[PDB]
Amino acid sequence: MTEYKLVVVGAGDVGKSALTIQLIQNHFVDEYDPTIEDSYRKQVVIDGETCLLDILDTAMRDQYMRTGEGFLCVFAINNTKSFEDIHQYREQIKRVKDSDDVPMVLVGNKCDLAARTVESRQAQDLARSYGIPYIETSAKTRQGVEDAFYTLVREIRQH
Numbered sequence: 001m002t003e004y005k006l007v008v009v010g011a012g013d014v015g016k017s018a019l020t021i022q023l024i025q026n027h028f029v030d031e032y033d034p035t036i037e038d039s040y041r042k043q044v045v046i047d048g049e050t051c052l053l054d055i056l057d058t059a060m061r062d063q064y065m066r067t068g069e070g071f072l073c074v075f076a077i078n079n080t081k082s083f084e085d086i087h088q089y090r091e092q093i094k095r096v097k098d099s100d101d102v103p104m105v106l107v108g109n110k111c112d113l114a115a116r117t118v119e120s121r122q123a124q125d126l127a128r129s130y131g132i133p134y135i136e137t138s139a140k141t142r143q144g145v146e147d148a149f150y151t152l153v154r155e156i157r158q159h
C-alpha cells in the first residue's frame with residue numbers, strides 16, 4: 001500500500017498535537033492529557049486508496065523533518081504571533097526540502113472559539129500567495145480535521 005510521511009509544524013500551543021491525536025484516536029487533548037509521543041502511524045482509506053500515514057508531531061528532529069513528504073503548517077486563530085511565525089516555518093521547510101514546491105496546507109486551528117484575532121481573509125490571502133490550501137480546523141469539535149490531513153495527502157499525490 002502507498003505510504004505518506006506527514007509532518008505537523010507550528011508555534012507553541014497552537015494545537016499540533018490536538019489535531020494529530022484527534023485524527024489518530026478521535027479524542028481531544030485538554031490541559032493535562034499526554035502529548036509526549038511524537039510519531040503516529042495509521043492505516044486509512046482515502047479516495048479508495050488504502051494509505052499508511054506516518055505523522056510526526058513536532059514539538060534528531062532535522063533528519064525527521066527532511067523526510068517529510070507534506071507539511072501541515074498550523075497557527076491558532078487567537079494567536080497573532082503564531083500566524084506571523086508561519087512564514088518562518090515555511091522557509092525552514094523549503095530549505096530542508098531544497099524545494100520551492102513542497103506539499104503544504106496552511107491550517108488555522110481553534111475555529112471553535114467565540115473570539116479571534118487572526119481573520120480568515122488574511123490567512124486565505126497568505127495561503128494564496130504561497131499557492132497552497134488554507135483550511136480552518138477545530139481539534140476540539142473535529143471540524144475540518146480530516147479535511148486538513150486528507151487535503152495534504154491529496155497535495156502529495158498531485159506533486
Ligand SMILES: Nc1nc2c(ncn2[C@@H]2O[C@H](COP(=O)(O)OP(=O)(O)NP(=O)(O)O)[C@@H](O)[C@H]2O)c(=O)[nH]1
Binds near residue numbers: 030
Ligand atoms: N478551544 C480549543 N482549544 C484547543 C484546540 N486545539 C488545542 N487546544 C488547546 O490548546 C492547548 C495546546 O494544545 P496542543 O495540541 O498541546 O498544542 P501543541 O501545538 O501540541 N503545543 P506544543 O508546541 O507544546 O507541542 C491545549 O490546552 C489544548 O486543549 C482547539 O481546536 N480549540
Ligand SMILES: [Ca+2]
Binds near residue numbers: 003
Ligand atoms: Ca516504507
Ligand SMILES: [Mg+2]
Binds near residue numbers: 035057059
Ligand atoms: Mg504538542
